[PDB]
Structure 1
Amino acid sequence: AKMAFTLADRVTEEMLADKAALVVEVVEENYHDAPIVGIAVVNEHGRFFLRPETALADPQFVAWLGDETKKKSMFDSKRAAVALKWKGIELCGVSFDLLLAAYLLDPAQGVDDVAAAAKMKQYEAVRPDEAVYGKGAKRAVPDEPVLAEHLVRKAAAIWELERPFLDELRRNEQDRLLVELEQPLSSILAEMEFAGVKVDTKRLEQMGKELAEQLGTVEQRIYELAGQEFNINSPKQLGVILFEKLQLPVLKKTKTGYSTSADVLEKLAPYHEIVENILHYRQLGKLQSTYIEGLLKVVRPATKKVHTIFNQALTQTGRLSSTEPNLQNIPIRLEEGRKIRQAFVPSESDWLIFAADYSQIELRVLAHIAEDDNLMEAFRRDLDIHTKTANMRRQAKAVNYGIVYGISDYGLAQNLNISRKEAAEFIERYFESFPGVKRYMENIVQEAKQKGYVTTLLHRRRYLPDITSRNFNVRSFAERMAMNTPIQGSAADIIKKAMIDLNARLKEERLQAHLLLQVHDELILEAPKEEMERLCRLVPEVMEQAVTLRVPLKVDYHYGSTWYDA
């Protein structure tokens, strides 16, 4: 716990070396337009703390931040890059990101501060952020010397840990995955988040007014059918109405009481009309609470834009997630919810939304990895396995994905409301047709037991230390992760590479088009209307060619005046 540094009052030349650990500290969880509270730089010449007022208004320091040839090692460089964009400053030359390095080494550690990453290498001359800032209502930036010491210690830790982290990544064959995939993607995600998506608030507000009226009507109908007023949004009060007052069968219980899951209620429709109304009510109520009210709460009023954060170091499989707001779960399944997407519009007049989605991506990946000749030929014939297995097609999608990822006879039976005996026979016939898939799934489970981890196409890893558990439930869930993770994660790898390849192609061709969102196997862009034709060729080609498998990748695309129309 002994570390010297300069608490600097001005930027000096020796701070601007061509290699440095850099900390640009943003304490708020949502870093969009958030205060930068302090800066630290550690390099060959020493350790320095700078006040952002000073540093960020200094033309040489701003120039250095933006100079790609001056290399910066950081932790969560996207947070810094976006926070700096909101300050009108461009950040370039990030050559190492400890957050992403830690994530690739082991996603289960849930590393989300420098101290947590440092623990992976038994480095402890740095405190956890939470210890320094405090939690909840007590959260605060400490006195300058305390803050300064913390930021310097974090920079010093990044400085010392780069080599040990790079060496372990290299040993895992994950060095390129970091340097050539995740780090380049980080800068692309920063651009998307800062761009944001424009919202039609007039439209959304009108939808909200009309939805409130409809909710009230459905609500009263439910009370009439029930013979009583109650809170429909309380599974507890609802369970009393359904299973005590109305005396409906109890199909399922949870730890806290009667289940009122949508699966259960749907099965209760032969007994009472009220369950279909309740299902409808809870759909409408989610639309209003989340996609009208919740969405309007996060719209920046002056620009009418929403700015999501794509968490790149969270999911256990290599996927992204999207928060505040989540723009990866906007309704589409039912027309009533899908209408929400009419409120998502282009950020300029005479621009349009373009959306492209990989078809059956995880099934194509699986064909390649499992080397199932039958499935592999299906895709070479450009057939549609979803339609072949076949609302029908949508319901058949869940069956295909259910079956390959280990659904049981009980689960398939409950899903299709068919006989458990019949469900079992359908699963047996399915593997009959795709014997390579069955073989693969048996083999990957055994491999996970032997190695302790599974891997994706671009060498992403997930450790599965529970997979030999003597406990049936613990073991079985781990085995199913062994079946699913390599495929979901390989599909993640591919779309990440496609985003990188696509941005480069957009720059080369000097298009104004740019990415707005990624939704797991879909890419959403906006562009001038004149660029649509080019996009129809470019976007799908770049996506389809991101990797070369034993089967072709296929990408569907559409464009229009709103996201709904795309």
Structure 2
Amino acid sequence: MAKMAFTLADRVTEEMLADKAALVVEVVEENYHDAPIVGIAVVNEHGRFFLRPETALADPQFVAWLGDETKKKSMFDSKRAAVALKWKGIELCGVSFDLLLAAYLLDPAQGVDDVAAAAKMKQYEAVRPDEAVYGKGAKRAVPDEPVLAEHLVRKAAAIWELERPFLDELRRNEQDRLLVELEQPLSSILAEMEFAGVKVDTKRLEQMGKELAEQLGTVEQRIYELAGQEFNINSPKQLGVILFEKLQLPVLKKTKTGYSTSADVLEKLAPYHEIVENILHYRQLGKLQSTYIEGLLKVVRPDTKKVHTIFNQALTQTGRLSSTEPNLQNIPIRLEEGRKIRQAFVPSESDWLIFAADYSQIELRVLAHIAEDDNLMEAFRRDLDIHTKTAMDIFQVSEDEVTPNMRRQAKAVNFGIVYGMSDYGLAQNLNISRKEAAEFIERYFESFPGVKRYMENIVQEAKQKGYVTTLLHRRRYLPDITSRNFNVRSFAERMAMNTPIQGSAADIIKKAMIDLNARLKEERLQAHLLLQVHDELILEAPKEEMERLCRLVPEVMEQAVTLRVPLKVDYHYGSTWYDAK
């Protein structure tokens, strides 16, 4: 009666197939793609059951219950179960409550990664953290059946008990529809995207691998010639001894252990010595090689030549997705050498093409909407180039008098407003003075007084309410907004300024993903989502569908919500992700 009672079941019975249940389909491998299911727990009105998966998943009655939309299941991290079951050809339906997503909407700062941490939010402690049962990292093991089954039954019993109070609190926060109509349906869409995966041209990556390895070997040798000795170019310390001690280059910035060797600093040092540009080029090549070529080839499935990312839907403090193993949300684009990596991401079938649609300036259009700044809203109703226009306003010039440097500076100020940075932050970002950065910000606020009002009002609202919200009622708690430490307080103020913009942008693209999946099914298109990259959706479709996607994808993305400004989506397609430009 400190132990939890359950049937360790040999076969599946009708009692286990009630039309409401807490279900655990446990996948212990962090990467759940084609991973084993180690055990199953069901808690329902009839009691508590553990089933061995070779039993339950081979039983036609259990499989049909899993697939029955009208048999409602409460889970934690239903996507993990959904995907592991997809790899076994088994459909999971009727998941009406996901505790991971419920806890994430109530408070993203909790970092709820297991049932125990979700349960601790409601004073429920009759369940162990996964880490205590499985261990961590290397020592990490499925334990023997009696320990495993008791753990899964306790997770299920916790889920069974916590559904009601999580749903009550979401309802009080007006997040009930954010759970049921946004995050849960998106969960199933991410499952499909992860499972379908993205085809890679591994031969192209291998060949890029070879060219890079030769170029690195060249640039390595040059570096040791200019330094007149061998060292580890990747040692943050050994590089600092070569640059600042042997060659005696000026120290323009320190960090902690010693000297900054960031690309910011190295660029300023290039004139002093021919070693610096070689070091910068070497780092560029080395990044492509380590992170992108070798990293990608490590996780490609040799049988299909696909990568299967995992979108973490319950991690970011703003409501964005993250992407792991591999991260397909940070593939190079800015420098042409890196951008060529995208030539290796190809359609998964013959005569298919990659279709990429991205929102134009979604953060600043969202800012124009929430601030109701008359001038910024007008700028977007004219579809002006927003950086050119901010330049005309802050420097008091006509369009024709805006220089490339003015535009670059106006662009950085636009980012500085969205990130809520201080004079210091903008000065650091622009390599200018603080008094200067403050004149820019003051002039911006004179051109956009509604944005100034919004920035002041949202800091005061975070202080008064304890949190800030997005368009679709996502929340972030900011307790540090009342700290008497200036740096901790200022960081909370920037989050109060930024989170509604970045979070509202995340809300809109998630709704567009839901609306777009429904429209593709209605339209009988084979086109499907592969990736989301924050303000961008990537699909693949038969070439015969491109003409329809050119009208449908932007339309659905533009109409996902109605703001006081239009939403604008650009779109391109081609043979590879690279060519979808």
TM (norm. structure 2) is: 0.95
* TM superposition shift of 1:136: 2.5
Residue 398 of structure 1: how far off its partner (Å):
3.8
What is the deviation of 1:324? Answer: 0.5
Range with greater deviation from structure 2 (147-156 or 250-259) = 250-259
In the TM superposition, residue 394 of structure 1 has moved relative to its aligned partner by: 7.2
Q: Which runs of 5+ in 1 are unaligned?
A: none
Instruction: Provide, for residues 414-453 of structure 1, a one-character-per-residue CA deviation record: whole Å limited to 9, x for no partner.
Output: 4334454433322222121111111111111111112211
Residues 470 and 500, structure 2, Cα contact 8 Å, conserved in 1:
yes
1:512–1:253 CA distance, 2 compared to 1 (3 A): same
Counterparts in 2 of 1:456 and 1:14: CA distance versus 1, 3 Å: same
Deviation at 1:407, TM superposition (A): 2.6
Which stretch shows the higher mean deviation, 312-321 or 213-222?
213-222
In the other structure, the counterpart of 1:51 is: 52
Report the Cα offset of residue 183 of structure 1: 0.3
Q: Which residue of 1 aligns with 2:282?
A: 281
- CA–CA separation in structure 1 for the residues paired with 2:132 and 2:199: 38
Distance 2:509 2:139 in 1: 40
The 1:101–1:494 alpha-carbon spacing in structure 2 relative to 1, beyond 3 Å, is same
User: What is the distance in 2 between the residues matched to 1:303 and 1:397?
Assistant: 42
3-state SS of paired residue (1:137) = coil
What is the TM-score when the length of structure 1 is the normalising length? 0.98
C-alpha separation in 1, matches of 2:227 and 2:572:
45
Residues in 1 aligned to 2:354 and 2:543: alpha-carbon distance in whole angstroms: 9
Task: Report if aligned partners of 1:361, 1:491 keep a CA contact under 8 Å in 2.
Answer: yes
Alpha carbons of structure 1 residues 5 and 132: separation in structure 2 relative to 1, 3 Å:
same
Q: Do the aligned partners of residues 404 and 36 (structure 1) sit closer, same or farther apart at CA in structure 2, a change above 3 Å counting?
A: closer
Give the SS at the match of 1:393. helix
CA distance in structure 2 between the aligned counterparts of 1:319 and 1:394, rounded to whole angstroms: 27
Alpha-carbon separation, structure 2, partners of 1:235 and 1:256: 9
Deviates more, 1:192-201 or 1:228-237: 228-237
User: Contact 2:201–2:346 at 8 Å: present in 1 too?
Assistant: yes
- Output the CA distance in 1 between the equivalents of 2:408 and 2:313: 29
C-alpha distance in structure 2 between counterparts of 1:379 and 1:180, whole Å: 29
CA–CA separation in structure 1 for the residues paired with 2:256 and 2:172: 45
Matched length: 566
SS class of match (1:173): coil
The alpha carbon displacement at 1:403 in A equals 3.2
Separation (CA, whole Å) in 2 of partners of 1:341 and 1:442: 42
| CA distance in structure 1 between the partners assigned to 2:367 and 2:291 by the alignment | 35
Report the CA distance between 1:497 and its aligned residue: 0.4
Q: Residues 364-411 of structure 1, C-alpha deviation per residue, up to 9 Å, x if partnerless?
A: 001100111100111111112034346997775443112342333344
8 Å CA contact 1:387, 1:393 repeated in 2: yes
Query: Counterpart in 1 of 2:496?
Result: 482
CA distance in structure 2 between the aligned counterparts of 1:422 and 1:535, rounded to whole angstroms: 47
CA deviation after TM superposition for structure 1 residue 556, in Å:
0.4
Write the deviation string for residues 309-337 of structure 1: whole angstroms up to 9, x where unpaired.
00000000100000011000000000010
Greater shift, 26-35 or 385-394, is seen at: 385-394
Q: Is the 8 A contact 2:100 2:113 kept in 1?
A: yes
CA contact (8 A) 1:404 1:437 kept: no
Q: 1:235: how far off?
A: 1.3
Greater CA deviation, 464-473 or 349-358? 464-473
SS of aligned partner of 2:323: strand
Q: Is the alpha carbon distance of 1:187 and 1:52 closer, same or farther for their aligned partners in structure 2, counting shifts above 3 Å? A: same
Q: What secondary structure is seen at the aligned counterpart in 2 of 1:270? A: helix
Cα distance in structure 2, aligned partners of 1:269 and 1:80: 53
1:291 paired residue number: 292
Q: For residues 351 and 393 of structure 1, do their structure 2 counterparts lie closer, same or farther at Cα, with a shift above 3 Å needed? A: farther
Asked if 1 retains the 8 angstrom alpha-carbon contact of 2:412 and 2:430, the reply is no
Matched, 1:509 2:510: no
Give the Å deviation of 1:142: 1.4
The runs of 5 or more residues in structure 2 that have no matched partner are: 392-404
- Which residue pairs with 1:95 in the alignment? 96
Deviation string, structure 1 residues 142-176 (Cα, Å, up to 9, x no partner): 11111111111111110010000000000000000
> Are the equivalent residues in 1 in contact too, given 2:193–2:530 (CA < 8 A)?
yes
Give the superposition deviation at 1:194.
0.3
Structure 1 residues 412 and 277 mapped into 2: Cα distance closer, same or farther (>3 Å)? Answer: farther
Partner of 2:482: helix, strand, or coil?
Answer: coil
Distance 1:410 1:324, change over 3 A: same
Structure 2 SS opposite 1:515 = strand
Deviations 1:333-365 (A, max 9, x none): 000100000000000000000000000000000
Kept after mapping to 2: 8 A contact 1:208/1:292: yes
Matching residue of 1:457: 471
Q: Which range is displaced more, 240-249 or 191-200?
A: 240-249
Q: Which moved more, 1:234-243 or 1:299-308?
A: 234-243
Cα 1:424/1:277, change in 2 over 3 Å:
farther
Do the aligned partners of residues 418 and 131 (structure 1) sit closer, same or farther apart at CA in structure 2, a change above 3 Å counting? closer
Give the whole-Å Cα distance in 2 for the aligned partners of 1:336 and 1:394.
23
Secondary structure at 1:165's aligned position in 2? helix
Indicate conservation of the 8 Å contact 2:527/2:539, yes or no.
Answer: yes
Aligned partner of 2:511 in structure 1 is 497
For 1:136, what is the secondary structure of its paired residue? coil
Instruction: Report the CA distance between 1:4 and its aligned residue.
Output: 1.6
By how many angstroms is 1:273 displaced? Answer: 2.9
Over aligned residue pairs, what C-alpha RMSD do you find?
Answer: 1.4
Note the alpha carbon deviations across 1:45-82, whole angstroms, 9 max, x for none. 11111110011011111111111111100000000000
- TM-superposed CA distance for 1:286, in Å, is 0.6
Identity of aligned residues (%): 99
* Residues 139-158 of structure 1: pairs in structure 2 closer than 5 A: 139-158=140-159
